[PDB]
Write an enzyme that holds these catalytic residues in place. Structure first.
Site, PDB file in Angstrom:
ATOM      1  N   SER A   1     -24.322   3.059  -9.970  1.00 60.11           N
ATOM      2  CA  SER A   1     -23.285   3.759 -10.710  1.00 60.11           C
ATOM      3  C   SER A   1     -23.931   4.711 -11.713  1.00 60.11           C
ATOM      4  O   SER A   1     -25.158   4.813 -11.813  1.00 60.11           O
ATOM      5  CB  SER A   1     -22.353   2.765 -11.406  1.00 60.11           C
ATOM      6  OG  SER A   1     -21.220   3.420 -11.951  1.00 60.11           O
TER       7      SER A   1
ATOM      8  N   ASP B   1     -23.526  17.419  -3.911  1.00 60.32           N
ATOM      9  CA  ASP B   1     -22.768  17.449  -5.159  1.00 60.32           C
ATOM     10  C   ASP B   1     -22.095  18.798  -5.384  1.00 60.32           C
ATOM     11  O   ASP B   1     -22.678  19.697  -6.000  1.00 60.32           O
ATOM     12  CB  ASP B   1     -23.666  17.099  -6.350  1.00 60.32           C
ATOM     13  CG  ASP B   1     -22.883  16.549  -7.530  1.00 60.32           C
ATOM     14  OD1 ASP B   1     -21.724  16.969  -7.730  1.00 60.32           O
ATOM     15  OD2 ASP B   1     -23.429  15.693  -8.259  1.00 60.32           O
TER      16      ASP B   1
ATOM     17  N   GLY C   1     -19.242   7.644 -10.347  1.00 58.79           N
ATOM     18  CA  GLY C   1     -18.891   6.245 -10.206  1.00 58.79           C
ATOM     19  C   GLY C   1     -19.730   5.495  -9.193  1.00 58.79           C
ATOM     20  O   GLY C   1     -20.908   5.809  -8.993  1.00 58.79           O
TER      21      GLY C   1
ATOM     22  N   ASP D   1     -24.328  23.962  -9.981  1.00 61.95           N
ATOM     23  CA  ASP D   1     -25.053  22.785 -10.454  1.00 61.95           C
ATOM     24  C   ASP D   1     -26.218  22.474  -9.517  1.00 61.95           C
ATOM     25  O   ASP D   1     -26.388  21.349  -9.046  1.00 61.95           O
ATOM     26  CB  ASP D   1     -24.118  21.582 -10.595  1.00 61.95           C
ATOM     27  CG  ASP D   1     -24.776  20.413 -11.310  1.00 61.95           C
ATOM     28  OD1 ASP D   1     -25.758  20.642 -12.049  1.00 61.95           O
ATOM     29  OD2 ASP D   1     -24.319  19.266 -11.128  1.00 61.95           O
TER      30      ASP D   1
ATOM     31  N   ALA E   1     -23.128   8.691 -14.071  1.00 59.47           N
ATOM     32  CA  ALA E   1     -22.598  10.043 -13.929  1.00 59.47           C
ATOM     33  C   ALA E   1     -21.151   9.998 -13.455  1.00 59.47           C
ATOM     34  O   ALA E   1     -20.222  10.079 -14.266  1.00 59.47           O
ATOM     35  CB  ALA E   1     -23.457  10.870 -12.967  1.00 59.47           C
TER      36      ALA E   1
ATOM     37  N   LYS F   1     -18.602   7.153  -1.842  1.00 62.03           N
ATOM     38  CA  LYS F   1     -18.496   7.421  -3.268  1.00 62.03           C
ATOM     39  C   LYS F   1     -17.070   7.182  -3.750  1.00 62.03           C
ATOM     40  O   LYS F   1     -16.103   7.400  -3.015  1.00 62.03           O
ATOM     41  CB  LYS F   1     -18.915   8.859  -3.602  1.00 62.03           C
ATOM     42  CG  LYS F   1     -19.182   9.090  -5.083  1.00 62.03           C
ATOM     43  CD  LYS F   1     -18.719  10.467  -5.531  1.00 62.03           C
ATOM     44  CE  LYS F   1     -19.820  11.500  -5.357  1.00 62.03           C
ATOM     45  NZ  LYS F   1     -19.455  12.811  -5.958  1.00 62.03           N
TER      46      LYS F   1
ATOM     47  N   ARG G   1     -32.058  16.777  -8.777  1.00 65.66           N
ATOM     48  CA  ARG G   1     -31.272  15.560  -8.612  1.00 65.66           C
ATOM     49  C   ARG G   1     -30.147  15.730  -7.600  1.00 65.66           C
ATOM     50  O   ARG G   1     -29.675  14.733  -7.044  1.00 65.66           O
ATOM     51  CB  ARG G   1     -30.691  15.125  -9.956  1.00 65.66           C
ATOM     52  CG  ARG G   1     -29.622  16.067 -10.479  1.00 65.66           C
ATOM     53  CD  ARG G   1     -29.117  15.667 -11.851  1.00 65.66           C
ATOM     54  NE  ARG G   1     -28.173  16.654 -12.369  1.00 65.66           N
ATOM     55  CZ  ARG G   1     -28.531  17.768 -13.000  1.00 65.66           C
ATOM     56  NH1 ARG G   1     -29.813  18.036 -13.202  1.00 65.66           N
ATOM     57  NH2 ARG G   1     -27.604  18.612 -13.432  1.00 65.66           N
ATOM     58  N   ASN G   2     -29.703  16.962  -7.353  1.00 64.44           N
ATOM     59  CA  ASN G   2     -28.624  17.231  -6.413  1.00 64.44           C
ATOM     60  C   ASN G   2     -29.140  17.670  -5.047  1.00 64.44           C
ATOM     61  O   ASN G   2     -28.390  18.269  -4.269  1.00 64.44           O
ATOM     62  CB  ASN G   2     -27.674  18.280  -6.990  1.00 64.44           C
ATOM     63  CG  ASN G   2     -26.952  17.789  -8.230  1.00 64.44           C
ATOM     64  OD1 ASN G   2     -26.680  16.596  -8.371  1.00 64.44           O
ATOM     65  ND2 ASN G   2     -26.641  18.707  -9.138  1.00 64.44           N
TER      66      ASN G   2
HETATM   67  C1  LIG Z   1     -31.166  10.704  -7.426  1.00 62.30           C
HETATM   68  C2  LIG Z   1     -29.796  10.138  -7.394  1.00 62.30           C
HETATM   69  C3  LIG Z   1     -29.528   9.484  -6.023  1.00 62.30           C
HETATM   70  O1  LIG Z   1     -28.547   9.815  -5.390  1.00 62.30           O
HETATM   71  N1  LIG Z   1     -30.460   8.485  -5.523  1.00 62.30           N
HETATM   72  C4  LIG Z   1     -30.311   7.773  -4.214  1.00 62.30           C
HETATM   73  C5  LIG Z   1     -30.910   6.383  -4.076  1.00 62.30           C
HETATM   74  C6  LIG Z   1     -30.780   5.610  -2.736  1.00 62.30           C
HETATM   75  C7  LIG Z   1     -30.044   6.257  -1.548  1.00 62.30           C
HETATM   76  O2  LIG Z   1     -29.920   5.546  -0.300  1.00 62.30           O
HETATM   77  C8  LIG Z   1     -31.037   4.584  -0.033  1.00 62.30           C
HETATM   78  C9  LIG Z   1     -29.430   7.674  -1.687  1.00 62.30           C
HETATM   79  N2  LIG Z   1     -28.752   8.243  -0.537  1.00 62.30           N
HETATM   80  C10 LIG Z   1     -27.493   9.108  -0.591  1.00 62.30           C
HETATM   81  C11 LIG Z   1     -26.829   9.469  -1.910  1.00 62.30           C
HETATM   82  C12 LIG Z   1     -25.603  10.318  -1.951  1.00 62.30           C
HETATM   83  C13 LIG Z   1     -24.994  10.643  -3.354  1.00 62.30           C
HETATM   84  N3  LIG Z   1     -25.711  10.639  -4.498  1.00 62.30           N
HETATM   85  C14 LIG Z   1     -24.883  10.958  -5.520  1.00 62.30           C
HETATM   86  C15 LIG Z   1     -25.282  11.071  -6.985  1.00 62.30           C
HETATM   87  C16 LIG Z   1     -25.712  12.559  -7.299  1.00 62.30           C
HETATM   88  C17 LIG Z   1     -27.080  12.553  -7.991  1.00 62.30           C
HETATM   89  O3  LIG Z   1     -27.030  13.410  -9.122  1.00 62.30           O
HETATM   90  N4  LIG Z   1     -23.618  11.170  -4.992  1.00 62.30           N
HETATM   91  C18 LIG Z   1     -23.681  10.977  -3.674  1.00 62.30           C
HETATM   92  C19 LIG Z   1     -22.466  11.120  -2.665  1.00 62.30           C
HETATM   93  C20 LIG Z   1     -22.008   9.928  -1.814  1.00 62.30           C
HETATM   94  C21 LIG Z   1     -20.834  10.095  -0.837  1.00 62.30           C
HETATM   95  C22 LIG Z   1     -20.121  11.451  -0.716  1.00 62.30           C
HETATM   96  F1  LIG Z   1     -19.052  11.606   0.172  1.00 62.30           F
HETATM   97  C23 LIG Z   1     -20.583  12.645  -1.570  1.00 62.30           C
HETATM   98  C24 LIG Z   1     -21.752  12.479  -2.538  1.00 62.30           C
HETATM   99  C25 LIG Z   1     -25.008  10.828  -0.668  1.00 62.30           C
HETATM  100  C26 LIG Z   1     -25.669  10.468   0.657  1.00 62.30           C
HETATM  101  N5  LIG Z   1     -26.890   9.621   0.683  1.00 62.30           N
HETATM  102  C27 LIG Z   1     -29.574   8.413  -3.000  1.00 62.30           C
END
Ligand SMILES: *CCC(=O)Nc1ccc(OC)c(Nc2cc(-c3[nH]c(CCCO)nc3-c3ccc(F)cc3)ccn2)c1
Length: 295
Positions: free
Chosen positions: A25, A155, A29, A137, A27, A50, A141-142
């Site tokens: 979680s 993002d 959720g 943005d 930023a 998400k 990180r994105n």
């Molecule tokens: C660096 C922040 C981060 O996302 N780390 C991360 C750790 C472990 C993972 O899987 C082992 C993944 N995979 C992943 C993440 C996302 C995702 N990340 C965010 C946070 C934005 C960071 O600033 N938001 C999403 C997300 C999830 C579902 C959606 F429909 C849209 C966006 C997506 C896919 N795979 C990451």
């Protein structure tokens, strides 16, 4: 001057995917990991889910944008689930975001990977420009990592769509990645994104350092107006640093266009160590989302 957006918004049943673990979680959720199994379609797709009230208007705006893009270097929406909370389902990027990846593997990242990543980020950004989409943005990180050889931009919570120069009104903005004209007049352009691209590249070349570390965001406007920029990272030749500096010019139109950044980094990528100086250079029916195409 028109162009109807005929993208399909797929609605997913909650019984189709099996959540497996919480990814974290903050930023926004909760972000889950899981597998998505379409009914009687013999596939298992690793996905990320998400969620976090009437903030549903914000999360649905991100779903609108994520469903409207289709590029190998931009993460697309697989669908949404309308249960008790609104869920966003996308392709799982197993290696995390690029910022955490470059920090954790500092001592094992070569110049070829660093230069290839900038090419791919520029490719996804040039595609967003072809769709007349301002990300607003862009940061390390994105940028998510599918494989160490394949990254994608993510993002779109702040992504705005132009027609045939966006003026913002909201609250929290990332000051240290924003162009000067966006900090003062809240003007956002595709060239405003190029400024953020330069800060994003600087993040990778410094192996995850924080820009303007120890500098309050209220004084960033004062510093950039005086002509100060981010310093030259130790590994970067002047060829690489000149490109970063060009993205930070006051006149918004000198910042190279994303199609030109593709070309420049492409040529540096076919001779990587001339431009970066680095010391010491049941899992059966699983389908990746990139190989699951629905008409
Ligand atoms: C660096 C922040 C981060 O996302 N780390 C991360 C750790 C472990 C993972 O899987 C082992 C993944 N995979 C992943 C993440 C996302 C995702 N990340 C965010 C946070 C934005 C960071 O600033 N938001 C999403 C997300 C999830 C579902 C959606 F429909 C849209 C966006 C997506 C896919 N795979 C990451």
């Amino acid at each position: 001057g028109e162009a109807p957006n005929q993208a399909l918004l797929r609605i997913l049943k909650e019984t189709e995917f099996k959540k497996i673990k919480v990814l974290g979680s903050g930023a926004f959720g909760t972000v889950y990991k899981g597998l998505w199994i379409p009914e009687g379609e013999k596939v298992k797709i690793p996905v990320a889910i998400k969620e976090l009230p009437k903030a549903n208007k914000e999360i649905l705006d991100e779903a609108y944008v994520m469903a409207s893009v289709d590029n190998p270097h931009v993460c697309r929406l697989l669908g949404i689930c309308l249960t008790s909370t609104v869920q966003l389902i996308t392709q799982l990027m197993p290696f995390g975001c690029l910022l955490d990846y470059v920090r954790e593997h500092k001592d094992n990242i070569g110049s070829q990977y660093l230069l290839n990543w900038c090419v791919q980020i520029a490719k996804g950004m040039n595609y967003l420009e072809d769709r007349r989409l301002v990300h607003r943005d862009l940061a390390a990180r994105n940028v998510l990592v599918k494989t160490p050889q394949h990254v994608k931009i993510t993002d779109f919570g702040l992504a705005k769509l132009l027609g045939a120069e966006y003026h913002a009104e909201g609250g929290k903005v990332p000051i240290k990645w924003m162009a000067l004209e966006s900090i003062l007049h809240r003007i956002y352009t595709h060239q405003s994104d190029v400024w953020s691209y330069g800060v994003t590249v600087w993040e990778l070349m410094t192996f995850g350092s924080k820009p303007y570390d120890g500098i309050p965001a209220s004084e960033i406007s004062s510093i950039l107006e005086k002509g100060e920029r981010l310093p030259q990272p130790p590994i970067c030749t002047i060829d690489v640093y000149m490109i970063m500096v060009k993205c930070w010019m006051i006149d918004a139109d000198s910042r190279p266009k994303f199609r030109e950044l593709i070309i420049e980094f492409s040529k540096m990528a076919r001779d990587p160590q001339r431009y970066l100086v680095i010391q010491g250079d049941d899992m059966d029916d699983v389908v990746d989302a990139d190989e699951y195409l629905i008409p």
